[PDB]
Design a protein around this ligand. Structure first.
Ligand SMILES: CC1(C)S[C@H]([C@H](NC(=O)[C@H](N)c2ccccc2)C(=O)O)N[C@H]1C(=O)O
Ligand SMILES: [O-]
Ligand SMILES: [Zn+2]
Ligand SMILES: [Zn+2]
Length: 241
């Protein structure tokens, strides 16, 4: 099996499919995990979500690469056998947006923060085809997120990057923090190279306040955790100021 250098390991409840791992989180929600092999370091796991909404599927984040993202679509075809309506990607870095071309080739409508689309070319990424915009309190402008079903998109403020967004899954107790949120036992906040160290703590807390009843917090590089992931992330971020 795949034993990443960074990221959660495989546990009971995980399905290996090609080069990826899938884990059911709820009747209608699965976590996708893909792995970047770094020469001399090993594999770095990155997680996103797959959500069934009636007769259609919604995706949060690509895999690291186009081929891995095509494998996600193949898993969906095999295990769910319903079309992917749209994908939302949570900022312009390779773990979240590296597979855009595979989504586009498949005819899937793609959405990202307008700022992520603006940064994408600068980051070696392909922009999403549609831009999300946000209110002053972080909630997505509904006209920019048409037919999103249970996906509730929230921009918490600058943190891991200035463009990072988060997604709650309405009708569940799950919320997705992407790379903004690290697990409750993490020793670091990960890559702070593009981070806003002044605002990170407030942004992490704003994510918590946006989804105050989410009990399962999903994130990019660890297994789903309790709300202690949010509070621990914010406490680490307090030390940056
Ligand atoms: C896992 C990370 C340390 S790397 C990843 C991201 N970096 C990339 O996607 C880079 N393309 C990359 C370069 C070299 C090795 C691994 C990733 C970032 O800068 O936020 N997210 C970071 C994070 O979530 O803290
Ligand atoms: O990232
Ligand atoms: Zn990032
Ligand atoms: Zn990351």
């Amino acid at each position: 099996e795949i034993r990443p250098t960074i990221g959660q390991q495989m546990e009971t409840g995980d399905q290996r499919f090609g080069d990826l791992v899938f884990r059911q989180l709820a009747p209608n929600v699965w976590q996708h995990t893909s792995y970047l092999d770094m020469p001399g370091f090993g594999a770095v796991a990155s997680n996103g979500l797959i959500v069934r909404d009636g007769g259609r599927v919604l995706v949060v984040d690509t895999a690291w690469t186009d081929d891995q993202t095509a494998q996600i679509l193949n898993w969906i075809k095999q295990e769910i056998n319903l079309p992917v309506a749209l994908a939302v990607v949570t900022h312009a870095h390779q773990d979240k947006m590296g597979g855009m071309d595979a989504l586009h080739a498949a005819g899937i409508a793609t959405y990202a923060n307008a700022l992520s689309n603006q940064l994408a070319p600068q980051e070696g990424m392909v922009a999403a085809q549609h831009s999300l915009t946000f209110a002053a309190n972080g909630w997505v402008e509904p006209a920019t997120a048409p037919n999103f079903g249970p996906l509730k998109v929230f921009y918490p403020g600058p943190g891991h990057t200035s463009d990072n967004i988060t997604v709650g899954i309405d009708g569940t107790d799950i919320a997705f923090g992407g790379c903004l949120i690290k697990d409750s036992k993490a020793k670091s906040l990960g890559n702070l190279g593009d981070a806003d160290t002044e605002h990170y703590a407030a942004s992490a807390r704003a994510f918590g306040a946006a989804f105050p009843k989410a009990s399962m917090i999903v994130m990019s590089h660890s297994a789903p955790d309790s709300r202690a992931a949010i509070t621990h992330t914010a406490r680490m971020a307090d030390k940056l100021r």
